[PDB]
Design a protein around this ligand. Sequence first.
Ligand SMILES: O=C(O)[C@]1(F)O[C@@H]([C@H](O)[C@H](O)CO)[C@H](O)[C@@H](O)[C@H]1F
Ligand SMILES: O=C(O)[C@]1(F)O[C@@H]([C@H](O)[C@H](O)CO)[C@H](O)[C@@H](O)[C@H]1F
Ligand SMILES: *[C@]1(C(=O)O)O[C@@H]([C@H](O)[C@H](O)CO)[C@H](O)[C@@H](O)[C@H]1F
Ligand SMILES: [Cl-]
Ligand code: NA
Length: 385
Amino acid sequence: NDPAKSAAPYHDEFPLFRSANMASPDKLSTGIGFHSFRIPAVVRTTTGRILAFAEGRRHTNQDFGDINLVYKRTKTTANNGASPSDWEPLREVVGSGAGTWGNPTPVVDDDNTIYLFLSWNGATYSQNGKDVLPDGTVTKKIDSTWEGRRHLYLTESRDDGNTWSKPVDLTKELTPDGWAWDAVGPGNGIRLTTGELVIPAMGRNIIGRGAPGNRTWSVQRLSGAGAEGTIVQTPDGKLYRNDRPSQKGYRMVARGTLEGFGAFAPDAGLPDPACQGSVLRYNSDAPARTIFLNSASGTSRRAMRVRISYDADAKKFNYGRKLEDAKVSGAGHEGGYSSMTKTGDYKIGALVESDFFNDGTGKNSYRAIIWRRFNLSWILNGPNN
Ligand SMILES: O=C(O)[C@]1(F)O[C@@H]([C@H](O)[C@H](O)CO)[C@H](O)[C@@H](O)[C@H]1F
Ligand SMILES: O=C(O)[C@]1(F)O[C@@H]([C@H](O)[C@H](O)CO)[C@H](O)[C@@H](O)[C@H]1F
Ligand SMILES: *[C@]1(C(=O)O)O[C@@H]([C@H](O)[C@H](O)CO)[C@H](O)[C@@H](O)[C@H]1F
Ligand SMILES: [Cl-]
Ligand code: NA
């Protein structure tokens, strides 16, 4: 079988975004703190530096209200984020206004420009409407007006994540007209063997063409796609969308190319409780591997499972390994949204939400984000394969 199984298994895990209830909570240099951190995204840059993004949810764990896009980088290009002291303090990409800056969806381009697509909504709008903000204000439902719709923003870094451009609004260009709710990712985009960028979004892929870091963007509309999509290029070189379902059950999968996709259909091999997931191209040479991470349950977010597919079209994934085999203590109950990258030292790097659950499903439940490193051997030597 997989020759990587013969390596010494390795795993390494600790909280990277520490909620307000924890010792040494993560705050900006300006003193700004956050109740909860949610919605992770992680990329390794061409230098080997690792950039980890999240939504800094200022006041509660809710998806609406004042939410800033925060991040951490590894201190050097070479440390691979192996220990807590390897990581810089919390920084901010964008936090302007009392609205929502979220859905981090980064992609590293060939020139090392890091593109970060984001969603935005106004301070007084929420997905469902009639939600109560900290000051008692009742939100309006997100609608199709300019003020009340979800926007699509793009920021980039030319200095290995050190600084970020003021986000530009690309809603009119890259979001279909008449839309209200929208989402990009969250998680990551990809660079294809043939050179294009592909960013998964609600109902569509965003395609980047042309010179690295100077791309032209267009929209590839997808029939039957989900709101929260993932994208990978499979070993056969084709495209693969693996999306969160609208109802609990299974991941929704479609395959295609830049010239078009086939139908979405449930993947019976990948149970999902209606939650975001992540997918990663690990390598293309024998055995070629695609990695997948989600909560492997039709009902629960607390069943995080990392898996490998050796299939040229990622038809079938193995059982993989439960993340709870390498449990983190003192950071709540692991499970929820995730993001993965390959590290510079031949590991998979994963960000995974965790929930203290101190207020149950309520707004005051503190949310933190765990950073994991593990090798293929660790996945393959799991007891349930
Ligand atoms: O055994 C595996 O690794 C697996 F679970 O089943 C494999 C396949 O069905 C045979 O077990 C090996 O040829 C798939 O190719 C793999 O992607 C995976 F799903
Ligand atoms: O959905 C779940 O699995 C859960 F039961 O509820 C989640 C959350 O409170 C609800 O999904 C509502 O947002 C927790 O993060 C999970 O740890 C778990 F408790
Ligand atoms: C997420 C969740 O925790 O379930 O849900 C999305 C969104 O509500 C769903 O995809 C349905 O459209 C939020 O945007 C995200 O912030 C998070 F809460
Ligand atoms: Cl969504
Ligand atoms: Na803000």
